[PDB]
Design a binder for this molecule. Structure first.
Ligand code: CLA
Ligand code: CLA
Ligand code: CLA
Ligand code: CLA
Ligand code: CLA
Ligand code: CLA
Ligand code: CLA
Ligand SMILES: CCCCCCCCCCCCCCCC(=O)OC[C@H](COP(=O)(O)OC[C@@H](O)CO)OC(=O)CCCCCCCCCCCCCCC
Ligand SMILES: CC(/C=C/C=C(C)/C=C/[C@@]12O[C@]1(C)C[C@@H](O)CC2(C)C)=C\C=C\C=C(C)\C=C\C=C(C)\C=C\[C@@]12O[C@]1(C)C[C@@H](O)CC2(C)C
Ligand SMILES: CC(/C=C/C=C(C)/C=C/[C@@]12O[C@]1(C)C[C@@H](O)CC2(C)C)=C\C=C\C=C(C)\C=C\C=C(C)\C=C\[C@@]12O[C@]1(C)C[C@@H](O)CC2(C)C
Ligand SMILES: CC1=C(C/C=C(\C)CCC[C@H](C)CCC[C@H](C)CCCC(C)C)C(=O)c2ccccc2C1=O
Ligand code: SF4
Lengths: 80, 739, 169, 168, 41, 160
């Protein structure tokens, strides 16, 4: 399964979570930004690696980073 | 306040000319990177994203059609003007079989005047392979003054179409209901446009082209031929050549149409003097076409209680296997310009290819069959246009599926049922493509390896394991027996390609029976295989344009997007555009093979010279039958052998063909930089270049960015097509002009 | 609307107000997209060069210098007979003059960048003509008109020598 | 309604009364989609050009300038004058005048106040008040239209039959 | 003629005019002094 | 002489090339009639060929064993009109182009909308800058001295 990391440059704009096609990211409470929220990656087993999450990231060099790793039938997007 | 048009919808102003990108909501803010410049031209004609109203898109399309027709009229006016002023048309008229048509002279600069060839008739210029001279002769044009007047009329018509486009966008723009009158539009395009154009052309042929060309074939010089208007004012100048005009129009109105058999014939074959189709046959053909199309125009209900409703016809064509059938197709084709473009472009390209075939098969112009460069150029050009238009039709079908397809409005109809079993279609088409490719190409490779191993009796040849195209030979036999048996009123077969006598004009073969052997079997199956693979790519693009097992929401990404990401193992080129890109490549492959087959087969087994005793000697000498069955044969006896004229053209009047050969090779190789590489490398190189510019304080405010992934693919495919087609263009033209 | 005094059917051009040759002649509006100070500097320099060149024609066809090189009454043919060496020296001397008279700032963007530079005012007045300000404006207008007339005449003489070949006489 | 010239046609709706030579003659409605000042300027330019052309054609078929080049009929004078460069000078100066005209017509269309065809060229007076100016404008327009038609007829007849000044 | 002149000031029109002028004076130099392999001086 | 080459004025193969080209052109000329434009064009071709060959012969041009002018670009002023003088001419013209482009970029870079003035050129300012490029060698060695030609550390750098 791929690896997804969140960095404290998160501004809690939720654009990553609402762009994930496989429900990998979610918004959790935080105290490091104005919005009081930070993205989390608790379901990386469903991560497919499409990187839509970091295409919607407005922070300078990203706050969500997807590191491709071992492959799985879920991560390979295999309907068969 | 008319019910069909809106008056003064858009003000005629230059203000928006000074605001580039005003049409787009995203581009209107102004450029920030160089990507804006490329996006400006990529969205210029995408009227769907510029307005949210179908009416505005339709009006823009209508005015764009007017602009295109004005451009076409300007091009035709230029052609006629060049024929009038910079051509040897008058000299070619008096010696069609010994003077090469030329209509473009080259200025004497930088030594380029060598391009002015010895085309004959005390003229120097570039030999013309568009066949305008033969067309003008078939029109009865015997003077360059008539060409000048046709050019002036073309200029006037081009201005008229420009004014029409301006008028119908800015002064009186039609409403959506006017555009959606598909019944009225079909009625008019079938009766008025097609039928009345055929009728008017039949009238022109009968009254101008029939007498003038008959006098020309009789040996009368163009100077003593009467002016065309005299054939109308004087019923005695035409009644001598065709002694049926003496009865006037009485036989027509008295149903005694047999009297007009003098100039409305049904002969078939070719004119022995000119080598083209009998112009009496052509006039009769256009008359019959006019009547048929006028009749066909009275089919759809427009404004009276009479005719058909296309909605009622489609909705009644259901079936046990097709569910709701054609229900909803009328709404699809009356609310989506992209669906209409798909159908029209596909059928238009297919029509262009059919035209290309019927052109050389039955030469319709005087002294055009013996002008081998003209025949080769016309066939290749029309087949290329057909392939491009077919790929465009597939592209716009995919665009309709992505954008204008409504799932709710198409419940259980044909479109829905096709998407529901797209897997089966694509898998079976994949199997067919593999079967056809394996067989055709592996038979070619088996022939090559048997020849390389010294086993000549193990080939798929005529003197070996033979694959006779018996079905095509049966059809050829049926056509050569048609006159008198199935077409009892015919005097000769439609084309001598099916069989018959060798038709030669001035010791040059015009048409001759095209024998089909094992070599034609293999190349025909190659054609079928390439066409099937192109269809596979395009149909996979259209069907999987909305969703798939990989990307269940591919429609939300649009028609044109590079990917969905490196995930799922990699989701490159999943668009539907990336399928029109690969399909463009495969169309290039298929059309290149088709034109190669045509060129080699014609040069080897049709074209040539006929000795006075009747011995036929061809351009190459019949090497197609035995050497077109191996890839080494194609490489050596066709490519290497017929490329001799291109490479040895330096210093001669064909040197421009060698230069274009080299430049097209350069462009084709240039394409591979964009096709093989990726955007990240070029962006990171532009980073260092920008560092240098910033170090010298010369970094542009518009930030330079590497071409987008989709634009990189588009540039690659455009350069690839240009280079390959230009290389084949120069090769064909130099080879067929030299010999 | 005011309308120009020279071209009476055209509106009065802008940017010419405080000048010593203003007759309102600018139908193409060259003063709108080009600096008027630079335009006057260029007009004055072109006029002065044309006046000197016209006088050079008339003297050359009449007087000439001793020597085989300087023996062509026709100015156009004298340009070729004299050879490149005498002409290149004139070119370099004119360049030296240009540099020292404008004191470095020689270009359209550099000249008049700081202002404080009356167009055409090199301060050249050794004989003292122009101390009285009353006749100064008349002298400026006369210089401008003579310069324009000399531009027209310099073109005329050069093209007469080209179409005939002998001289001006 | 019911324009003066064509009594059964409606008034062109752009020519009420406030133009010299305005009899309401625009059946095909050229004024409905083109500026009135632009059309007036074009008409006056045509009038003046054709008046000069008719006078020149008629005179040059009678009186010739000294020289062998000027010894041709006005019908054949175009190919001779273009070769000698005589028409080149006219082209140059007419192009200068027409560029100044480009400026003038642009200014007139974008405000200004210059009447169409009014170049203020009036060395003599010949027009002292508004009434005299209007009468002379009407005379100029009528004479110009007559001369345009006259030059048309002269050229067509001379080309049809290569006759001298009587082009019958 | 305020926005038309601004349209003529756009990058494509200006580049086309400049390249047409450039090719023009190059072609005319090569017409009046053809076959120039070295510097004329 | 230099590199074993010989002057083209004494190169027999050069004259053979000239004679062959003229003979081909005359043979082409034979197949046309009288003073017709084709014959005039071919005669002009012959005249231009002769003039070009004569000019190349009297041009201090060195010809090889193939009878074609070879360029001596080692730097010697003897053959200075082959490379060195065209090199100076191009350097002047290209420096002019680069200087006017850089000046325009830096000038409209200090306005409210720098990017707008790059797709829609300020033709007055463009003309002002373009005709000022004749002093580009002097302007360059007056801006480099003042430190206005080179940026120092406001330039951006990647991570490593
Ligand atoms: C739309 C099609 C088309 C095309 C491809 C051409 C192409 C050409 N025309 Mg042409 N022409 C056309 C339409 C066309 N014309 C029309 C509609 C007319 C009638 C007005 C003419 C009238 C015409 C004349 C009278 C001449 C040409 C000439 C030429 C050639 C040189 C053009 C040139 O250098 O101009 C450069 C243009 C510019 C720099 C303007 C920017 C070139 C092959 C010339 C030629 O062949 O010389 C021997 C020539 O003398 N054309
Ligand atoms: C008999 C009547 C008639 C005729 C001849 C045509 C002919 C044409 N139509 Mg058309 N049309 C008609 C009725 C007709 N239409 C009606 C009733 C409707 C309403 C439903 C439409 C709606 C329509 C649309 C929406 C479009 C066309 C287009 C076209 C052109 C197709 C391009 C082509 O084949 O090039 C052949 C070209 C020629 C043969 C050149 C000569 C044709 C000239 C222009 C005659 C045109 C006839 C015109 C209708 C007369 C009106 C004159 C006006 C003063 C009223 C062609 C010119 C398409 C096009 O190209 O747009 C411009 C297009 O997009 N038509
Ligand atoms: C009747 C014909 C027709 C029409 C009306 C359209 C219309 C349209 N197409 Mg389309 N298309 C066509 C034929 C047609 N196409 C064909 C034949 C193909 C197959 C190649 C395609 C493939 C295609 C794709 C793949 C796409 C479109 C798109 C579009 C839309 C936007 C077009 C645009 O902005 O381009 C503006 C025009 C340009 C950018 C011009 C580019 C220059 C071309 C590529 C090079 C031409 C070179 C030329 C031959 C000269 C070379 C000579 C050399 C020596 C210089 C528009 C609705 C796009 C879209 O989004 O649709 C919604 C899109 O993605 N089309
Ligand atoms: C010469 C190069 C080449 C070759 C051989 C192929 C071959 C093929 N392409 Mg293509 N393609 C090419 C270049 C080529 N392409 C390029 C440059 C592009 C870029 C645009 C594409 C883009 C492209 C697309 C987009 C698609 C194809 C498809 C296909 C397949 C069609 C089905 C078929 O005939 O399979 C049969 C295989 C052959 C004819 C190859 C030769 C096989 C020999 C003759 C017979 C068997 C030999 C035997 C097994 C050897 C065993 C011994 C060995 C173990 C030592 C086929 C594999 C389609 C596809 O997937 O298939 C349906 C498809 O959709 N191609
Ligand atoms: C439309 C205007 C016009 C044009 C195009 C021509 C053209 C021509 N005329 Mg002509 N002519 C004109 C008006 C015109 N004329 C008028 C109005 C007269 C009466 C005075 C004459 C009297 C005339 C004679 C007597 C002769 C010609 C001849 C000729 C031919 C060669 C010499 C020449 O240019 O004329 C030279 C013209 C003149 C000597 C008199 C011209 C007087 C002008 C037109 C009146 C003042 C108008 C003013 C200058 C406008 C200013 C223009 C503005 C842009 C600055 C040439 C075809 C000669 C020829 O070859 O005959 C066949 C010849 O012998 N013309
Ligand atoms: C834009 C650049 C440019 C420049 C600087 C020139 C410069 C010149 N041209 Mg010219 N010309 C150009 C473009 C240019 N031309 C173009 C694009 C065409 C159309 C193809 C022509 C057609 C042309 C003709 C027909 C003639 C000139 C002539 C001339 C010369 C006298 C004027 C002069 C050297 C004339 C000349 O010197 O010939 C004797 C001449 O008769 N030119
Ligand atoms: C990039 C390398 C390169 C170089 C160094 C040259 C150099 C040359 N080429 Mg050439 N050429 C090239 C690429 C190159 N070309 C390419 C890619 C092609 C294919 C399109 C050609 C096609 C070509 C032809 C067809 C011809 C040349 C000719 C020439 C020569 C005359 C140049 C000229 O007109 O000067 C005169 C013009 C100038 C010096 C312009 C500058 C003048 C300015 C205005 C001065 C103002 C400031 C003071 C020259 C030696 C011509 C020749 O005679 O060959 C010997 C010739 O006929 N070339
Ligand atoms: C060819 C077979 C054919 O067209 O028969 C026609 C067959 C009959 O379908 P329907 O009777 O339902 O069609 C009635 C209406 O839809 C008219 O189109 O269509 C199919 O079943 C499609 C299956 C294609 C299978 C490909 C093999
Ligand atoms: C005289 C002239 C202009 C004169 C104006 C003058 C003096 C007045 C100027 C001033 O009042 C103003 C305006 C304003 C004041 O503040 C300044 C002054 C100075 C007081 C232009 C001539 C302009 C002269 C021109 C344009 C001449 C063009 C000639 C051509 C084209 C000849 C071509 C041929 O000779 C060839 C080439 C080959 C031959 O075989 C064929 C032909 C055709 C004959
Ligand atoms: C055309 C021209 C002037 C045209 C003026 C016109 C139309 C004026 C019209 C007006 O005034 C009137 C009529 C009335 C006014 O109220 C209104 C306007 C409209 C203002 C000047 C040309 C002027 C032309 C000039 C000055 C040309 C000079 C050429 C020189 C010096 C050439 C030198 C060389 O040719 C040699 C000697 C040898 C070569 O081998 C080398 C070089 C170096 C190239
Ligand atoms: C080189 C290259 C670039 C860089 C290419 C750029 C930045 C294009 C630069 C184009 C210039 C700026 C304008 C065109 C200049 C030409 C001389 C004009 C065309 C020639 C005419 C005759 C048409 C990419 O951005 C890219 C992206 C994706 C895959 C491959 C590639 C790729 O190979
Ligand atoms: S960039 Fe190239 S590779 Fe990476 S995802 Fe987009 S398409 Fe697939």
């Amino acid at each position: 399964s791929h690896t997804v990391k969140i960095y404290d440059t998160c501004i809690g704009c939720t654009q990553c979570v609402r762009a994930c096609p496989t429900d990998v990211l979610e918004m959790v409470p935080w105290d490091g930004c104005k919005a009081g929220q930070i993205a989390s990656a608790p379901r990386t087993e469903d991560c497919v690696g499409c990187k839509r999450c970091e295409t919607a990231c407005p922070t300078d060099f990203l706050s969500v980073r997807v590191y491709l790793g071992g492959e799985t039938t879920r991560s390979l997007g295999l309907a068969y | 306040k008319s019910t069909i048009v809106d008056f003064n919808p858009v003000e005629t102003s230059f203000e928006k000319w000074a605001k580039p990108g005003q049409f787009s909501r995203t581009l209107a803010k102004g450029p920030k990177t160089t990507t804006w410049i490329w996006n400006l031209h990529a969205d210029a004609h995408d009227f769907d994203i510029q307005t949210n109203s179908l009416q505005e898109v339709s009006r823009k399309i209508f005015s764009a059609h007017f602009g295109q027709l004005a451009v076409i009229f300007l091009w035709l006016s230029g052609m006629h003007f060049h024929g009038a002023y910079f051509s040897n048309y008058s000299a070619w008229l008096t010696n069609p079989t010994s003077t090469k048509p030329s209509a473009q002279i080259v200025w004497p600069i930088v030594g380029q005047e060598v391009l002015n060839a010895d085309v004959g008739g005390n003229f120097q210029g570039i030999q013309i392979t568009s066949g305008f001279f033969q067309l003008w002769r078939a029109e009865g044009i015997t003077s360059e003054v008539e060409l000048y007047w046709t050019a002036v009329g073309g200029l006037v018509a081009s201005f008229l179409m420009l004014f029409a486009g301006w008028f119908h966008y800015h002064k009186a723009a039609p409403k959506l209901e006017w555009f959606q009158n598909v019944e009225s539009m079909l009625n008019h395009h079938l009766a008025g446009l097609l039928g009345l154009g055929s009728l008017s052309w039949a009238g022109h042929q009968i009254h101008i082209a029939l007498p003038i060309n008959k006098l020309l074939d009789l040996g009368v010089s163009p100077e003593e031929i009467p002016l065309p208007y005299e054939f109308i004012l004087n019923r005695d100048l035409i009644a001598q050549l065709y002694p049926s005009f003496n009865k006037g129009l009485t036989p027509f109105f008295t149903l005694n149409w047999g009297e007009y058999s003098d100039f409305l014939t049904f002969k078939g074959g070719l004119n022995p003097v000119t080598g083209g189709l009998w112009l009496t046959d052509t006039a009769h053909h256009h008359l019959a076409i006019a009547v048929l199309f006028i009749v066909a125009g009275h089919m759809y209900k427009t404004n009276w209680f009479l005719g058909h409703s296309i909605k009622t016809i489609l909705e009644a064509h259901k079936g046990p296997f097709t569910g709701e059938g054609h229900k909803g197709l009328y709404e699809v084709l009356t609310t989506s310009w992209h669906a209409q473009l798909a159908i029209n472009l596909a059928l238009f390209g297919s029509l262009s290819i059919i035209v290309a075939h019927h052109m050389y098969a039955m030469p319709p112009y005087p002294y055009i069959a013996i002008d081998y460069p003209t025949q080769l150029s016309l066939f290749t050009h029309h087949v290329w246009i057909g392939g491009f238009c077919i790929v465009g039709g597939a592209a716009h079908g995919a665009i309709f599926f992505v954008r204008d397809y409504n799932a709710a409005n198409n419940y259980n109809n044909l479109i829905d049922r096709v998407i529901r079993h797209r897997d089966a279609i694509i898998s079976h088409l994949n199997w067919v493509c593999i079967f056809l490719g394996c067989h055709s190409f592996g038979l070619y490779v088996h022939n090559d390896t048997m020849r390389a191993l010294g086993r000549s009796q193990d080939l798929f040849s005529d003197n070996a394991i033979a694959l006779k195209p018996i079905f095509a030979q049966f059809i050829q036999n049926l056509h050569t027996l048609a006159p008198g048996s199935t077409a009892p009123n015919a005097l000769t077969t439609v084309s001598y390609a099916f069989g018959g006598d060798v038709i030669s004009v001035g010791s040059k073969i015009a048409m001759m029976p095209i024998s089909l052997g094992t070599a034609d079997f293999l190349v025909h199956h190659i054609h079928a295989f390439t066409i099937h693979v192109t269809v596979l790519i395009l149909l996979k693009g259209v069907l999987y344009s909305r969703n798939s097992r990989l990307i269940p929401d591919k429609a939300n990404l649009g028609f044109r997007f590079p990917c969905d990401g490196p995930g799922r193992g990699g989701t490159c080129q999943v668009s539907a555009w990336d399928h029109v890109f690969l399909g463009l490549f495969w169309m290039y492959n298929s059309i290149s093979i088709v034109i190669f087959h045509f060129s080699w087969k014609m040069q080897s087994d049709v074209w040539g010279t006929v000795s006075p005793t009747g011995a036929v000697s061809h351009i190459t000498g019949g090497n197609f039958a035995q050497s077109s069955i191996t890839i080494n044969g194609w490489l050596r006896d066709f490519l290497w052998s017929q490329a001799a004229q291109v490479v040895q053209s330096y210093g001669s009047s064909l040197s421009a063909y060698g230069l274009i050969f080299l430049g097209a090779h350069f462009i084709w190789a240039f394409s591979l930089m964009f096709l093989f590489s990726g955007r990240g490398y070029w962006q990171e190189l532009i980073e260092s270049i920008v560092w240098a510019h910033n170090k010298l304080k010369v970094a542009p405010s518009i930030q330079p960015r590497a071409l987008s992934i989709t634009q990189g693919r588009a540039v690659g495919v455009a350069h690839y097509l240009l280079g390959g087609i230009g290389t084949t263009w120069a090769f064909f033209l130099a080879r067929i002009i030299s010999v | 609307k005011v309308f120009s005094k020279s071209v009476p059917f055209l509106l009065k051009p802008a940017g010419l107000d405080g000048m010593v040759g203003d007759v309102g002649f600018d139908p193409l509006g060259f003063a709108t997209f080009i600096d008027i100070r630079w335009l006057r500097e260029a007009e004055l320099k072109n006029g002065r060069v044309a006046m000197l060149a016209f006088l050079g024609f008339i003297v050359q066809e009449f007087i000439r210098l001793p020597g085989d090189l300087y023996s062509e009454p026709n100015g156009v043919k004298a340009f070729f007979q004299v050879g490149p060496q005498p002409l290149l020296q004139i070119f370099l001397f004119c360049g030296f003059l240009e540099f020292n008279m404008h004191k470095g700032k020689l270009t359209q963007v550099d000249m008049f960048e700081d202002g404080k530079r009356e167009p055409g005012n090199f301060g050249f007045d050794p004989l003292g003509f122009g101390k009285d300000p009353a006749k100064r404006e008349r002298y400026a207008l006369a210089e401008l008109k003579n310069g324009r007339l000399a531009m027209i005449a310099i073109g005329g003489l050069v093209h007469h020598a080209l179409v005939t070949g002998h001289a001006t006489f | 309604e019911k324009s003066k010239a064509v009594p059964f046609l409606p008034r062109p709706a752009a020519l009420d009364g406030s133009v010299v030579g305005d009899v309401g003659f625009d059946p095909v409605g050229f004024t409905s989609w083109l500026p009135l000042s632009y059309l007036q300027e074009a008409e006056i330019k045509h009038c003046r050009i054709a008046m000069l052309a008719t006078l020149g054609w008629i005179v040059a078929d009678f009186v010739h300038l000294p020289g062998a080049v000027h010894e041709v009929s006005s019908l054949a004078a175009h190919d001779v004058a273009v070769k000698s460069g005589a028409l080149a000078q006219i082209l140059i100066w007419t192009s200068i005048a027409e560029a100044i005209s480009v400026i003038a017509i642009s200014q007139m269309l974008e405000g200004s106040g210059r009447q169409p065809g009014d170049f203020k060229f009036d060395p003599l007076n010949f027009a002292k008040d508004e009434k005299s100016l209007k009468k002379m404008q009407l005379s100029e327009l009528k004479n110009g239209r007559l001369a345009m038609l006259a030059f048309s007829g002269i050229v067509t007849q001379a080309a049809l039959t290569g006759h001298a000044f009587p082009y019958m | 003629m305020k926005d038309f002149l601004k349209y003529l000031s756009t990058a494509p029109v200006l580049l086309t005019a400049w390249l047409t002028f450039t090719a023009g004076f190059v072609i005319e130099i090569n017409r009046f002094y053809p076959d120039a392999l070295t510097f004329p001086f | 002489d230099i590199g074993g080459l010989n002057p083209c004025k004494d190169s027999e193969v050069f004259q053979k090339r000239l004679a062959k080209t003229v003979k081909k052109l005359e043979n082409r000329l034979k197949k046309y009639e009288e003073g017709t434009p084709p014959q005039i064009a071919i005669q002009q071709q012959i005249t231009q060929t002769k003039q070009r060959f004569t000019r190349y012969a009297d041009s201090n041009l060195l010809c090889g064993n193939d009878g074609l002018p070879h360029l001596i670009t080692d730097g010697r002023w003897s053959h200075g009109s082959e490379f060195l003088l065209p090199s100076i001419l191009f350097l002047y013209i290209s420096g002019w182009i680069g200087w006017v482009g850089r000046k325009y970029i830096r000038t409209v870079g200090q306005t409210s909308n720098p990017t707008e003035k790059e797709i829609i050129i300020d033709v007055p300012l463009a003309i002002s800058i373009m005709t000022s490029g004749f002093l580009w060698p002097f302007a360059a060695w007056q801006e480099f001295l003042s430190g206005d030609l080179i940026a120092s550390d406001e330039t951006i750098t990647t991570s490593p």
